[PDB]
């Protein structure tokens with residue numbers, strides 16, 4: 001079902017959360033080789049998550065589930081904000097701009113924390 005498909009999508013998002021927090025520790029410790037690998041892993045987790053969320057939104061639309069479509073449109077929009085900040089973080093790492101990396105890291109944390117009440121709403125709505 002679309003609801004179980006969302007819980008799977010939710011688990012992929014939580015894998016990205018776990019890897020992200022590990023990466024943040026590696027950044028603080030100056031272990032740039034670990035960071036590089038974790039950023040590659042995160043990119044793959046975010047790409048997967050994004051595609052899964054699109055399939056869920058499209059299914060909700062086909063089912064005529066207006067409330068779930070509304071919430072998923074809002075949630076996917078916020079997802080794109082996090083993704084843009086993530087991509088900027090990756091660029092800051094490439095460029096060796098630790099100040100920008102710290103900034104973007106904190107911004108990505110706040111954007112993700114804000115989107116959580118909506119994330120739980122969607123589970124109930126599907």
Ligand SMILES: Cn1ncc(C(=O)O)c1-c1ccccc1
Pocket residue numbers: 006009010013014017049112115116119120123
């Ligand atoms: C509860 N829930 N349902 C979907 C998601 C997601 O990130 O897709 C989440 C979520 C997971 C970790 C942090 C914030 C939201």
